[PDB]
Design a protein around this ligand. Structure first.
Ligand SMILES: Nc1ncnc2c1ncn2[C@@H]1O[C@H](COP(=O)(O)OP(=O)(O)O)[C@@H](O)[C@H]1O
Ligand SMILES: Nc1ncnc2c1ncn2[C@@H]1O[C@H](COP(=O)(O)OP(=O)(O)O)[C@@H](O)[C@H]1O
Ligand SMILES: CC[N+](CC)(CC)CC
Ligand SMILES: NCCC[C@H](N)C(=O)O
Ligand SMILES: [Cl-]
Ligand SMILES: [Cl-]
Ligand SMILES: [Cl-]
Ligand SMILES: [Cl-]
Ligand SMILES: [Cl-]
Ligand SMILES: [Cl-]
Ligand SMILES: [Cl-]
Ligand SMILES: [Cl-]
Ligand SMILES: [K+]
Ligand SMILES: [K+]
Ligand SMILES: [K+]
Ligand SMILES: [K+]
Ligand SMILES: [K+]
Ligand SMILES: [K+]
Ligand SMILES: [K+]
Ligand SMILES: [K+]
Ligand SMILES: [Mn+2]
Ligand SMILES: [Mn+2]
Ligand SMILES: [Mn+2]
Lengths: 379, 1058
């Protein structure tokens, strides 16, 4: 018997079993509807300071493997699941889930009523919680740390997960046959994109390369002036944890870029940054969107896409500046999903066109981005 | 776009009688589509020869045709209703096949009927094996190495290309009909011949083996805007090589990584796009090599299916409802999601926070000489489904809900059996229906996970789970009841162990375990199905039990509640008929204002459609599970009389536990079911009953037999012995002893008793005599030979019995008429399977009436007091599964083997019969050569039958004894050699297409066994044959009729009643 306890800000306790590191973990608690893709989710930087609960009972059926990691580490603050399977059974598995968590030093609990949890969060909205795994997990304590949690509202986490120094990315996407391919040679990639690392998913980068982009990853705080110097064929605003709002450096920069004719594309946090930079306002959603079955309509084409979502903040549609035209909306709640600059080659998507995990439905968003580039180069 | 407007009327092609591989799932789907289109304000016309369907209920559509599902007949329906469009994707292969014939026959053109949902081309593209294969390659999806055949020669050549074992798959068939696995040449020829003949397009696809790879399915829905969604993914437990329908399957998929799942998901959508399914759903099948993720496309079903039904139950997403709406121009984004209170659109992919398990139900015991090994051709007669928070819980719940007397992993072999491992080994290596239990026994016997894997190819992911359950059971057995502390017991419950299973291991009564849970306050919670993993609330109460924290039941304190217990998975003898009743009980009572609670776990049925009731508990129909619901619902009354044997068997126990059982009491039920109890009441009532004995010893029987008199009906399976020598004979191979009433008419009577009066629902005269199971006999309503004089006697006898036994609601009585004498065969104090047919025939919804009676409203009070005798004849005919089990002698007897039934409506008996026979898929012709080969006791009457066929233009053939009798009558048949006689013999003649009709009657175990060849050949070669003289006469009669001449709707039928 290796106990684990999870306590929410409201005093709601969930007693289960420890399946990862011994320790405590505090963060915002969220729920994720993805029936597959747990590993990629765990390694999503946007999960920084967030305790992840998965709705699908059995988590770990396929074990883990390096190709399925979206970053260099496990961003989730903690993991809450209903059942940890006896075994991992998949040809791609290199390490069982528990071993994996232990290895990444993650506090995780299993065997709790995840459904009860989920409905709580949906009903009463996001809550901060704490997980304690050890011989005797002190509830009172757990309540203390959860309650003590600052909160993700107004929390800039992009700066925390961003690369120290810039770097170059030339690697493409995985194949069943080929696995993760060798990185390409520079002369091999047509365009050169500058990507702000706000806690970037490897899949976004790989998918950009896939379309013939050579990348230069840059720290979040990099200055427009510095970027411009690079003579970028386009600029990219990655996804990332926390509140976009407090990221003044990024906003300021973006505005600078928006004075030029260079193509700009934002994904998730980058979407929010773009919006803010344009004069819009962001809000923190009740419980947000975390799942991979989220319908999003392309208002222009009147076509729906099932997408991969991971966001706790949104862009308020009703505050949109006239230079911002709505391109996509959620079919689940009507929330804002995409925007394009009426006047500039700048657009973004709230969801994850790169998926990983998730439907490949929104991939074409990238395509547009290339178009703009190809056309910016024609000039 | 919104709904189509260039359409007003829609004809929906129904599935026909229930058969192995094409079952209840089509009533559910068909009903959903009627409902959907009807809600959309279309005029709906439907055809379905299966009267036991909710979709044929008069109030569900506008023009309902219970007519044979033949293109000529449908043509007459189209000619007469002039539908604008036809939807052919809600009725099995029957509907697909018919839609295309109609097209081929140019009928569609002729009347300007537009095919919707799916086009003829799409359908063919998926149904034509060659075409499908071409399309896959065209979209870069891999398919097994294969080849097309249209002849045995070509087939032999493909086999030669792929080698054995090989997989044979007919074009235009499903449920593995006409297919199989050829391990050798011999087998190869058999299967292939069979499938070529059976293929509507006389085409086979022969593939190399992928046996053992993983098997997956995906349910897809695509709209005209090109929106596409995965409604559900399914991972088969049983690997490739065992048909999906005969496999244990779960949702969602479990062992694919997200990367693999996306590829599969992309493939699925690509397949629909290529085939051209633009406005509805489809089931896409695949094979995955566990070793490397290698993906192969197996097939695609351009329609609703047993999997889409399963998927609908599993996720809460009503596929068929949505599809019907798509068929009419609606787009997914336009429709709302039912269960999330319409709060969200149908354009999304469901997410579930639980595990769904489906386990097929077999009936091999009913087919002695059949090959009981599982293969690519379905052999299952039904299925159960379970929902659990975990796989173990889910699986165990399904096992206990299976209705096979399992409480979970009950042992099959003894621990102390020296040959046990060998037996296990065999069952594992060559899966039969019992495999699941042998797996558990394997673990108890010392076999490892890897060892079991190697034999079975079932993914270790599942296997480890069963092993863990075994180890847990071993603990229980060691610690015994003493060791069942609250902590441990809870752990056990969470893994889905039934109280009964635990009881057996602890050597206590199941009630003890249950008391123990009461003590510890260890009760399950109820979660709701919502399609979105609780991301959105729901206003629907579709729930399942689980041992968790939070309860989602929220019972009302408000209403008086009525609970309706389902029968679980369908099996032979316990079909859709019972579910029909259950549904009616619910619609009526609900309509009456009660809060109706349905308890059932059959994924195929309308009973488990959340629309059917106020509250749906998708649970095993067991005392344990029902007690838990009552516990929390505190219903006013519970109906146990409508779900067949399943709930019937729980009646006593439920009452004992304080359950408020309504309608005929459990004691009352027992008086009828108990031979002894029953013998006394008969005696009590001064009623006629065949002489009977109760023999314990062989020699006791032979004496008692002398008393009773031969022939004899030996009920312990049933047998009919004819002489002393026969008695021993049986006894060897082998107790009630009953005189068998030879040359007797069998009759069924359905009635309702409210304690005040008795309402006669219907008097049905069977065609086949007593001795041929009522369930396998065709019948007429009204009788077609029975004197009024005699029927009245039976009516009076039914009233006498209704009152005596205290019937409260439905009943059914079976009599035998011999020499103007009424003999009582049996009484069934509940809803019988004839109920739906009688309701249809008479226009009286007996299940609804009996339900109201059970609930308090008298017959007088409802204004249903007089027996209805319709102006037309209604004939019911059955469909037998013999074609699925060729080793089986296709002969009728005292034991029921049929799967379904149809109904024929005619101005005369001959016309009704004609329609019934045709509806039953009979290959009868109105010309040709007939073969007569009858027993002694029939030689007399055969003359008149031989003449009748003569008048018709038939030529006759006959075996020795028959020819002799006919000769003496002045009828000179063409002699034919019995097989031992010489040549040619019947076999040869039948095999060479000589006959268009066969009448063969036999009496005596020995005589039967000897004549086996005739029947088996008649079936294999598709010749219509009768095994009863009564049957032949009926056939004779029908020839004078034309089943396509006229068609009438149920609405019309019912308006004709005065
Ligand atoms: N190449 C193969 N090797 C082994 N089993 C196969 C192969 N192809 C198909 N099967 C098996 O046969 C079953 C029936 O084939 P399917 O194409 O689905 O026909 P149907 O339309 O009659 O259901 C599959 O569910 C699977 O178990
Ligand atoms: N004594 C008998 N004489 C003739 N036929 C009988 C006799 N007893 C039963 N049968 C035949 O056997 C069938 C099944 O017997 P029944 O008592 O009704 O059992 P079940 O429980 O299967 O309905 C009847 O439908 C009938 O054809
Ligand atoms: C599957 C049902 N049939 C094939 C379409 C055979 C019973 C109808 C004739
Ligand atoms: N109602 C039973 C089916 C009849 C079949 N043709 C037989 O006589 O065997
Ligand atoms: Cl909990
Ligand atoms: Cl806010
Ligand atoms: Cl078929
Ligand atoms: Cl291969
Ligand atoms: Cl391979
Ligand atoms: Cl067989
Ligand atoms: Cl004919
Ligand atoms: Cl005889
Ligand atoms: K727990
Ligand atoms: K038309
Ligand atoms: K097909
Ligand atoms: K191939
Ligand atoms: K299978
Ligand atoms: K299937
Ligand atoms: K009969
Ligand atoms: K009976
Ligand atoms: Mn098929
Ligand atoms: Mn199939
Ligand atoms: Mn009976």
């Amino acid at each position: 018997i290796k106990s684990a306890l999870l306590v929410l800000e409201d005093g709601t306790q969930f007693h289960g079993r420890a399946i990862g590191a011994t320790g405590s973990a505090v963060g915002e608690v969220v729920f994720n509807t993805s029936m597959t893709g747990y590993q990629e989710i765990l390694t999503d930087p946007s999960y920084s300071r967030q305790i992840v609960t998965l709705t699908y009972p059995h988590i770990g059926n396929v074990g883990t493997n390096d190709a399925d990691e979206e970053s260099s580490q496990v961003h989730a603050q903690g993991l809450v699941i209903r059942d940890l399977p006896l075994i991992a059974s998949n040809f791609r598995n290199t390490e069982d889930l528990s071993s994996y968590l232990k290895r990444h030093n993650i506090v995780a609990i299993a065997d709790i009523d995840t459904r009860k949890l989920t409905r709580l969060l949906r009903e009463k909205g996001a809550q901060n919680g704490c997980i304690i795994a050890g011989d005797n997990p002190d509830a009172a304590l757990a309540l203390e740390k959860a309650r003590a949690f600052p909160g993700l509202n107004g929390m800039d986490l992009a700066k925390e997960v961003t690369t120290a120094e810039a770097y170059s990315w030339t690697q493409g996407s995985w194949t069943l046959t080929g696995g993760l391919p060798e990185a390409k040679k520079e002369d091999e990639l047509p365009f050169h994109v500058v990507a702000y690392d706000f806690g970037a998913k490897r899949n976004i980068l790989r998918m950009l390369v896939d379309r013939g982009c050579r990348l230069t990853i840059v720290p979040a705080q990099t200055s427009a002036e510095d970027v411009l110097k690079m003579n970028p064929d386009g600029i990219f605003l990655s996804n990332g944890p926390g509140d976009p709002a407090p990221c003044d450096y990024a906003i300021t920069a973006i505005q600078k870029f928006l004075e030029t004719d260079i193509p700009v594309f934002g994904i998730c946090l980058g979407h929010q940054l773009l919006a803010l930079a344009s004069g819009a306002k962001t809000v923190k959603m009740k419980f947000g969107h975390h799942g991979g079955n989220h319908p999003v309509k392309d208002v222009e084409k009147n076509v729906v896409m099932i997408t991969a979502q991971n966001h706790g903040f949104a862009v308020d549609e009703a505050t949109l500046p006239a230079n911002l035209r709505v391109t996509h909306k959620s079919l689940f709640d009507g929330t804002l999903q995409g925007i394009h600059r009426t006047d500039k080659p700048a657009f973004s998507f709230q969801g994850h066109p790169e998926a990983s995990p998730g439907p490949h439905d929104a991939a074409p968003l990238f395509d547009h981005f290339i178009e703009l580039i190809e056309q910016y180069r024609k000039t | 776009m919104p709904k189509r407007t260039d359409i007003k009327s829609i004809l929906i092609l129904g599935a026909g009688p229930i058969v192995i591989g094409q079952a209840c799932e089509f009533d559910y789907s068909g009903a959903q589509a009627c409902k959907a289109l009807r809600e959309e304000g279309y005029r709906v016309i439907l055809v379905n020869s299966n009267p036991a369907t909710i979709m044929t209920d008069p109030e569900m559509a506008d023009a309902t045709y219970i007519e044979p599902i033949h293109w000529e007949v449908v043509r007459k329906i189209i000619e007469k209703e002039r539908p604008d469009a036809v939807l052919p994707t809600m009725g099995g292969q029957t509907a697909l096949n018919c839609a295309l014939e109609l097209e081929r026959q140019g009928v569609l053109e002729e009347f300007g009927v537009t095919m919707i949902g799916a086009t003829a081309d799409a359908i063919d593209k998926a149904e034509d094996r060659r075409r499908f294969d071409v399309a896959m390659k065209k979209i870069g999806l891999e398919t097994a190495r294969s080849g097309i055949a249209h002849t045995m020669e070509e087939a032999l050549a493909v086999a030669a290309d792929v080698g054995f074992p090989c997989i044979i798959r007919p074009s235009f068939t499903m449920g593995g009909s006409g297919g199989g696995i050829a391990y050798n040449r011999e087998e190869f020829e058999e299967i292939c011949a069979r499938g070529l003949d059976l293929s509507p397009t006389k085409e086979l696809l022969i593939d190399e083996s992928l046996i053992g790879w993983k098997e997956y399915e995906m349910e897809v829905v695509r709209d005209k805007n090109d929106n596409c969604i995965i409604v559900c993914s399914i991972e088969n437990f049983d690997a490739m090589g065992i048909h999906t329908g005969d496999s244990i399957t779960v949702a969602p998929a479990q062992t694919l990584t997200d990367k693999e799942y996306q590829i599969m998901r992309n493939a699925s959508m690509a397949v629909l796009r290529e085939i051209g399914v633009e406005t509805g759903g489809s089931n896409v099948q695949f094979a995955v090599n566990p070793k490397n993720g290698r993906l192969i496309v197996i097939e695609m079903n351009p329609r609703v299916s047993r999997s889409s039904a399963l998927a609908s139950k599993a996720t809460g997403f009503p596929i068929a409802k949505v599809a019907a709406k798509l068929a009419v121009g609606y787009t997914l984004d336009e429709l709302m999601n039912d269960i999330t209170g319409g709060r969200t659109p149908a354009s999304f992919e469901p997410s579930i926070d639980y595990v769904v398990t489906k386990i097929p139900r077999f009936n091999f015991e009913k087919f002695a000489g059949a090959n009981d090994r599982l293969t690519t051709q379905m052999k299952s007669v039904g299925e159960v489904m379970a929902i659990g928070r975990t796989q173990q819980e889910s699986l165990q719940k399904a096992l206990r809900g299976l209705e096979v007397g399992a409480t979970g992993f009950d042992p099959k072999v003894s621990l102390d059996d020296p040959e046990a491992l060998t037996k296990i080994r065999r069952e594992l290596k060559d899966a039969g229906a019992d495999r699941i239990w042998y797996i558990a026994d394997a673990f108890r016997a010392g076999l490892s996970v890897d060892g079991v894997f190697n034999l079975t190819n079932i993914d270790r992911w599942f296997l480890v789970q069963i092993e863990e359950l075994v180890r847990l059971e071993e603990k229980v057995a060691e610690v015994g009841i003493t060791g069942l502390n609250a902590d441990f017991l809870r752990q056990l419950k969470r893994k889905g162990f039934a109280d009964a299973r635990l009881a057996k291991l602890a050597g206590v009564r199941e009630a003890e375990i249950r008391k123990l849970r009461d003590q510890y306050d260890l009760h399950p919670v109820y979660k709701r199905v919502d399609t979105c993993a609780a991301e959105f609330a729901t206003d629907t109460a579709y729930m399942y039990s689980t041992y968790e924290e939070e309860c989602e039941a929220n019972p009302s304190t408000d209403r008086e509640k009525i609970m309706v217990l389902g029968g679980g998975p369908n099996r032979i003898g316990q079909g859709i008929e019972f579910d029909y009743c259950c549904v009616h009980a619910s619609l009526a009572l609900r309509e009456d204002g009660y809060e109706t609670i349905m308890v059932n776990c059959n994924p195929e049925t309308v009973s488990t459609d959340y629309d059917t009731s106020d509250r749906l508990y998708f649970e095993p129909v067991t005392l344990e599970d029902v007690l838990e619901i009552v516990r929390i619902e505190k219903p006013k009354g519970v109906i146990v009389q409508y779900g067949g044997q399943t709930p019937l068997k729980l009646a006593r126990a439920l009452e004992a536990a304080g359950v408020p059982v309504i309608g005929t009491s459990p004691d009352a039920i027992d008086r009828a079911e108990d031979r002894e109890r029953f013998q006394h009441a008969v005696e009590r009532l001064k009623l006629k009953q065949p002489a009977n004995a109760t023999v314990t010893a062989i020699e006791m029987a032979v004496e008692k037999a002398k008393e009773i008199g031969y022939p004899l009906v030996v009920r312990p399976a049933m047998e009919i012995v004819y002489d002393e020598a026969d008695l021993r004979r049986y006894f060897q191979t082998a107790v009630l002893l009953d005189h068998f009433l030879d040359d007797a008419v069998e009759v069924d009577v359905d009635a309702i008793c409210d304690g005040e009066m008795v309402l006669i629902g219907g008097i049905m005269e069977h065609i086949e005599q007593a001795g041929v199971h009522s369930g396998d006999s065709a019948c007429s309503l009204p009788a077609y030979t029975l004197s009024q004089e005699i029927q009245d006697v039976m009516r009076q006898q039914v009233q006498k019995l209704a009152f005596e036994l205290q019937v409260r609601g439905l009943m059914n009585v079976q009599f035998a008429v011999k020499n103007n004498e009424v003999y009582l065969i049996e009484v069934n104090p509940r809803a019988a399977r004839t109920v739906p047919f009688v309701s249809k025939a008479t226009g009286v919804p007996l299940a609804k009436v009996a339900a109201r009676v059970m609930a308090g409203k008298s017959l007088a009070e409802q204004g249903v007091t007089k027996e209805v005798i319709p102006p037309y004849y209604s004939v019911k005919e059955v469909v037998l599964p013999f074609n699925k089990f060729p080793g089986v002698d296709p002969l009728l007897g005292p034991e029921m083997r049929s799967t379904g039934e149809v109904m024929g409506v005619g101005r005369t008996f001959a016309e009704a019969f004609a329609k019934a026979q045709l509806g039953s898929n009979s290959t009868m012709k109105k010309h040709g050569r007939a073969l007569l080969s009858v027993r002694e006791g029939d030689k007399e009457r055969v003359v008149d039958l031989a003449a009748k066929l003569l008048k018709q233009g038939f030529e006759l053939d006959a075996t020795h004894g028959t020819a002799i009798v006919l000769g003496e009558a002045g009828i000179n048949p063409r002699l034919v050699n019995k097989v031992h006689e010489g040549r040619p013999h019947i076999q040869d003649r039948i095999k060479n297409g000589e006959y268009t009709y066969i009448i063969n009657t036999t009496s005596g175990r020995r005589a039967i066994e000897d004549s086996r060849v005739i029947r088996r050949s008649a079936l294999q070669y598709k010749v219509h044959y009768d095994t009863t003289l009564n049957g032949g006469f009926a056939t004779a009669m029908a020839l004078n009729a034309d089943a396509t001449e006229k068609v009438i709707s149920v609405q019309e039928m019912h308006a004709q009643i005065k």
